[PDB]
């Protein structure tokens, strides 16, 4: 069943935000690894680590609460659901909260961010809003 695991990892990060948990295990497909690498390099995460194992592997996330109790990530969203996939052209790539958020968009040359896909001027699957 499970019907898509990317939306499930985004809700797992969101529930760890709302509980204010500090670590997460996520079952780590390769696109999940690249998403967490993007969220690492954009400062939404402290650090991300991989646990390569026998079942499917584990990726662990260290949620970043920079000040007193401040969820840097307020909300997540999945755009292309498995049953309505969404694809944006390069002159339609959405820039979110105009600059203050971001959209994870996996084009033909690497799983890119907003600015990366904008500077490479290509579009593909549009698979996360990250606020």
Partner 1 sequence: SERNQRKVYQGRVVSDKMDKTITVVVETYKKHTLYGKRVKYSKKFKAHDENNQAKIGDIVKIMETRPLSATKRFRLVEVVEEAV
Partner 2 sequence: RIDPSKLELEERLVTVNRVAKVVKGGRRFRFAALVVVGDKNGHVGFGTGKAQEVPEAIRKAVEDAKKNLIEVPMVGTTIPHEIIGRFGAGNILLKPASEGTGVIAGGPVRAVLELAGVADILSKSLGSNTPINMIRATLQGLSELKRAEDVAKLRGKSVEELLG
Partner RNA sequence: CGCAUUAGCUAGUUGGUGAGGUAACGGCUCACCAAGGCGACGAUGCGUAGCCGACCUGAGAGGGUGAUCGGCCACACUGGGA
Partner RNA sequence: GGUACCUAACCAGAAAGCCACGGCUAACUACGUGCCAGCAGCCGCGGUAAUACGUAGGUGGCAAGCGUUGUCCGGAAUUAUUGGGCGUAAAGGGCUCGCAGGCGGUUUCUUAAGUCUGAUGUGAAAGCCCCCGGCUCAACCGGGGAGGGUCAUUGGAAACUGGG
Partner RNA sequence: CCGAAGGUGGGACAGAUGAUUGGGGUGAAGUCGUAACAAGGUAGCCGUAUCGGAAGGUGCGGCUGG
Element (H, E) at 103: strand 102-106
What is the Cα–Cα distance from 114 to 2, expressed in whole angstroms? 28
In the complex, least distance from residue 98 CB atom to RNA, rounded to whole angstroms: 15
- Residue 33, exposed/middle/buried by CB under 10 A (0-12, 13-18, 19+)? middle
For partner 2, the binding residue among 44, 63, 123, 127 (CB under 8 A) is 44
Q: How many residues bind partner 1 (CB under 8 A)?
A: 4
What is the Cα–Cα distance from 67 to 38, expressed in whole angstroms? 22
What is the Cα–Cα distance from 82 to 4, expressed in whole angstroms? 7
In the complex, least distance from residue 85 CB atom to partner 1, rounded to whole angstroms: 7
Q: Is 69 in the site for partner 2 (CB under 8 A)?
A: no
In the complex, least distance from residue 69 CB atom to RNA, rounded to whole angstroms: 29
With a CB cutoff of 8 Å and minimum separation 6, the contacts of 77 are 10, 128, 129, 131
In the complex, least distance from residue 121 CB atom to RNA, rounded to whole angstroms: 6
For partner 1, the binding residue among 19, 83, 98, 108 (CB under 8 A) is 83
Output 83 or 99, the one with its CB closest to partner 1.
83
Site residues, partner 2 (CB under 8 A)? 42-44, 64, 66-67, 70, 72, 74, 97-101
Residues in the site for partner 1, rule: CB under 8 A?
83-86
């Amino acid at each position: 069943v499970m019907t898509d695991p990317i939306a499930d990892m985004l809700t797992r990060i969101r529930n760890a935000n709302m509980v204010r948990h500090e670590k997460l295990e996520i079952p780590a497909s390769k696109l999940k690894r690249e998403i967490a690498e993007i969220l690492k390099r954009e400062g939404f995460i402290r650090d991300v680590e991989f646990v390569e194992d026998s079942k499917q592997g584990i990726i662990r996330v260290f949620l970043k609460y920079g000040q007193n109790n401040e969820r840097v990530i307020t909300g997540l969203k999945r755009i292309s659901k498995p049953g309505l996939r969404v694809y944006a052209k390069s002159n339609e790539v959405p820039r979110v909260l105009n600059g203050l958020g971001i959209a994870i968009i996996s084009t033909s040359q690497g799983v890119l961010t907003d600015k990366e896909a904008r500077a490479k001027q290509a579009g593909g699957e549009v698979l996360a809003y990250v606020w």
